[PDB]
């Protein structure tokens with residue numbers, strides 16, 4: 001796990017920045033086009049500062065090792081633009097371009113800001129397959145949310161942004177860093193803010209998945225109205241958030257119930273959530289026509 005950012009080549013005459021599509025923890029993410037081929041790629045540009053140096057090395061290594069997986073946006077390589085001595089250099093991280101954008105963007109471009117149970121089931125399983133791969137390699141994402149779940153032109157689900165992700169040595173290993181997006185953060189993660197003896201593990205990603213499912217169902221996560229600091233206080237003490245409507249199937253209500261167990265000890269693991277009827281029983285690996293058509297309607301207008 002040794003990266004040198006000196007032997008990296010200049011991106012001039014290879015990739016160019018077309019438009020800004022989003023941002024990722026540290027950096028601004030662009031739609032990059034290859035100068036010759038016209039091949040599209042997601043490119044995160046960020047200043048190589050001493051404060052965010054080891055956190056960028058962490059990301060690259062994690063992407064080099066695990067991004068091959070079909071449910072993780074594939075890392076191609078890195079370039080660097082040299083600013084004059086004393087100034088910070090621009091690091092370019094090139095990656096698979098997810099043409100349809102984020103789950104959050106699909107929600108906003110759907111009637112009543114609510115997705116079908118069958119899309120939520122499909123996406124939730126693809127996220128679980130991505131998380132299962134990561135957790136098996138002692139990885140915690142620690143920032144699972146609609147914004148970090150992207151879709152390709154083929155409506156293939158991809159996890160992105162390993163900027164606040166943890167690499168563990170031992171299987172039973174634990175973390176204590178208060179990090180993530182407040183609305184999606186698990187209670188045992190939020191505990192670490194004030195309590196210095198509090199520790200968490202991979203289970204925290206399965207809570208965030210639970211909130212991401214509610215995000216897809218209702219259009220936004222629980223406590224999205226109030227201030228993040230006003231939300232961080234209630235998550236640990238309030239009862240597990242549920243779906244407002246009862247029109248949702250009993251199996252989908254059961255999946256949110258399984259995901260959002262506040263006590264991480266009683267919470268099911270990744271492999272257990274895969275066997276849950278909501279994940280196991282779906283109409284799969286061919287029939288995603290509705291999604292591919294839904295994003296084609298967005299392309300026109």
Ligand SMILES: CC(C)n1cnc(-c2ccc(F)cc2)c1-c1nc(C(=O)Nc2ccc(N3CCN(C)CC3)cc2)c[nH]1
Pocket residue numbers: 021022023024025029042043044073075076093094095096097098099100101102105147148150160161162298
């Ligand atoms: C931003 C995301 C949270 N992110 C954080 N960090 C990295 C990243 C990028 C490159 C690397 F090498 C490493 C990390 C990434 C990352 N966004 C992508 C990506 O493809 N994003 C994308 C593409 C298209 C859209 N459109 C919006 C408008 N219309 C509806 C059409 C679609 C929106 C967003 C791929 N990776």
Ligand SMILES: [Mg+2]
Pocket residue numbers: 067068069070071072073074075
């Ligand atoms: Mg991949």
